[PDB]
């Protein structure tokens, strides 16, 4: 899969239509989020019931085993301190791990109220009771010498602070699905988010809320619903610990992209440079290399996006190998045959054979015979990547200047804002101030500089990754981030993780191999001896033992680490090096 980004020009009326569509999609996103939060309770209840059953089974199997070990096992979790047990008891401890998190409960006599979520989907849930009244707020005047694990630290205390209203209890009541007020689907329950894919019901809801009917097409509705489905799935997955509940979008955080994940562009006229997509009159293209990049005579457009960026308006077209189409055509048939013939039928096996065959065809469609060269790569402080043969690649030094320019422009903008606010207050008005034209221009400039920095870094990373992928077939990559324990400011401008990911993907696509050796003892070890050497400078290294061939010979530390990574990768060649 690839994405082609083509600049387009829109007329004023088209811009107004785009703004209206984005407002509509923001409203849809908020509605879907509210509905999903209201519904999460029904999933939580089933989860709790299953957990209770599991706890009961664990309790039964823990009691049924012999009393001698069960007491110590119970204590193992029933006590902060944990001793070194034997394998016998440790096995049972693992087998009843669940007690580490919870202890058996009933969950009977409950009534299924709508829960209020916190920072996770499973733990920390609560049932609301009341609204209004004073609330706890941090008071920095209160210093509490809290004896945390790090000793005494003077944390800011909390105190009760002015309330919004008089305290009032909420009317407890079970959960109830919400439904479309009227129209052709009156009374339908919105069990899932996919039930919101209907234009009719959404129009009915808007009428209930006294808003004008929707004008956006159903394709962008589907795209936004896809985005929300992704974010919610990430939220509920335990394996990801950084994905949390989706947030509500305020007026200053409107959606900035229209997504069509149902059909390619309706028309792509290359001779006159025109693109016809749904919901707009034909859009002109102001791009000069779009016909060569898109390469319509050998690819297959699938989906697209109208994107807005400080540089202008773009259309993203996603393209794939020509075979992709049948693969999907077969994939979407799998649920049918499974429902119709069962997974043991011969049809099921034949379909899997055909999927595999097409997937293999696609994969081999982009394999290139190589020269079987192996490389060790080490991210550096002075050089973005050092290589086993002594190559040091300079970083994207240009972006530091953009960052400094952003610093200065932000300083200017904030100074202007402070002076304007003071003059506003002096005149005697209490209403919030309205932003000025110079401030808007300066803010646009800052936005454009951020974009330019991001784009420059992305372009540099693509170029370097392509270079490495073309030159080398086997790549070893490991990063010694111990230095982190301004350096952070410099490293945030290099984008090492993106570089690594791009190189990984491109090397895999060409048919190479990508390894990630462990990092233990990589920077200080004499790679030709394995002994811990010494450094006589910020970047030089010398081996210690006299038996070394390179004894008393200073060498580049980055080259040493790169060669160590090459060895740990298993290639062990290290034949030559430049300086």
């Amino acid at each position: 899969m690839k994405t082609i980004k083509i600049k387009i020009k829109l007329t004023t009326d088209q811009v107004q239509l785009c703004d209206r569509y984005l407002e509509e999609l923001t409203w849809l996103w908020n509605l879907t989020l509210s509905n999903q939060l209201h519904n999460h309770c029904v999933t939580w209840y089933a989860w709790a019931a299953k957990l209770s059953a599991d706890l009961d089974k664990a309790t039964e199997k823990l009691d049924k085993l012999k009393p001698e070990q069960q007491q110590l096992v119970k204590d193992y979790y029933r006590t902060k301190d944990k001793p070194r047990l034997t394998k016998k008891e440790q096995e049972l401890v693992a087998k009843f791990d669940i007690f580490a998190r919870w202890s058996s409960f009933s969950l009977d006599g409950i009534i299924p109220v709508p829960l209020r979520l916190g920072n996770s989907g499973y733990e920390g849930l609560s049932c609301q009771i009341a609204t209004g009244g004073n609330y706890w707020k941090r008071d920095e005047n209160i210093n509490i010498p809290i004896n945390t694990k790090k000793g005494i630290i003077h944390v800011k205390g909390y105190k009760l602070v002015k309330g919004d209203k008089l305290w009032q209890r909420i009317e407890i009541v079970p959960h109830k699905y919400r439904t479309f007020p009227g129209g052709k689907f009156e009374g339908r329950e919105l069990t899932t988010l996919e039930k919101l894919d209907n234009v009719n019901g959404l129009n009915t809801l808007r009428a209930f809320q006294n808003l004008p009917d929707l004008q956006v097409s159903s394709h962008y509705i589907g795209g936004l619903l896809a985005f929300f489905k992704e974010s919610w799935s990430a939220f509920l997955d335990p394996k990801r610990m950084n994905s949390r509940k989706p947030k509500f979008k305020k007026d200053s955080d409107k959606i900035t992209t229209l997504s069509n994940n149902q059909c390619a562009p309706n028309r792509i006229d290359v001779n006159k440079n025109i693109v016809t997509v749904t919901g707009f009159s034909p859009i002109t293209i102001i791009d000069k290399n779009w016909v060569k990049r898109l390469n319509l005579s050998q690819v297959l457009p699938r989906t697209y996006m109208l994107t807005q960026n400080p540089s202008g308006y773009y259309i993203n077209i996603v393209i794939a190998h020509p075979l992709h189409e049948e693969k999907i055509a077969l994939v979407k048939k799998l649920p049918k045959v499974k429902k119709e013939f069962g997974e043991d039928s011969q049809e099921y096996e034949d379909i899997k054979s055909k999927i595999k065959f097409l997937e293999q065809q696609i994969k081999e469609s982009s394999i290139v015979k190589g020269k079987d060269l192996s490389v060790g790569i080490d991210p550096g402080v002075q050089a973005v990547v050092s290589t086993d043969h002594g190559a040091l690649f300079l970083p994207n030094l240009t972006r530091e200047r953009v960052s400094i320019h952003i610093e200065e422009l932000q300083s200017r903008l904030d100074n202007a804002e402070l002076i304007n606010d003071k003059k506003w207050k002096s005149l005697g008005n209490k209403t919030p101030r309205i932003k000025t034209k110079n401030e808007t221009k300066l803010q646009e400039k800052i936005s454009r500089l951020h974009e330019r920095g991001a784009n420059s870094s992305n372009a540099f990373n693509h170029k370097l990754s392509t270079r490495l992928s073309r030159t080398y077939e086997h790549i070893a990559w490991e990063d010694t981030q111990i230095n982190n324990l301004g350096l952070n400011w410099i490293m945030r401008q290099r984008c090492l993780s993106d570089l690594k990911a791009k190189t990984k993907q491109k090397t895999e696509n060409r048919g190479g191999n990508f390894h990630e050796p462990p990092a233990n003892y990589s920077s200080q070890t004499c790679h030709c001896c394995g002994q811990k050497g010494e450094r006589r400078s910020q970047h030089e290294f010398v081996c210690k033992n006299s038996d070394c061939k390179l004894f008393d010979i200073p060498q580049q530390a980055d080259t040493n680490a790169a060669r160590n990574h090459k060895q740990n990768g298993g290639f062990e060649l290290g034949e030559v090096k430049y300086h």
Binding site: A100, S126, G133
Partner: protein, 105 residues
């Protein structure tokens, strides 16, 4: 072992009583509340003397919960001679409550 609290005596029992008192706000029709009750009983028996613990049914002492900024159950308030030393909301897991108390004590 857990002491059961009432509105009428809350001030003396919680505010005048010596030592730290962990008060849990409770109801019976609540799900997560039944999830965490066993943990509170555990903490009652592990930390004896180092901490005292109390339970307050909101459905029988409706006045107390508003007075202390509580808007949903379950909630845990750690008091120390008339002021809440610590506050937490939502069904913590066993470990979470354990290190919470460890840090606060």
């Amino acid at each position: 072992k857990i002491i059961h609290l009432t509105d009428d005596s809350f001030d003396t029992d919680v505010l005048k009583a010596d030592g730290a008192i962990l008060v849990d706000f409770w109801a019976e029709w609540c799900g997560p509340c039944k999830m965490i009750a066993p943990i509170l009983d555990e903490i009652a028996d592990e930390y004896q003397g180092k901490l005292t613990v109390a339970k307050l049914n909101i459905d029988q002492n409706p006045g107390t919960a508003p007075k202390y900024g509580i808007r949903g159950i379950p909630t845990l308030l750690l008091f120390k001679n008339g002021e809440v030393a610590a506050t937490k909301v939502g069904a913590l897991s066993k470990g979470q409550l354990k290190e919470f108390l460890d840090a606060n004590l």
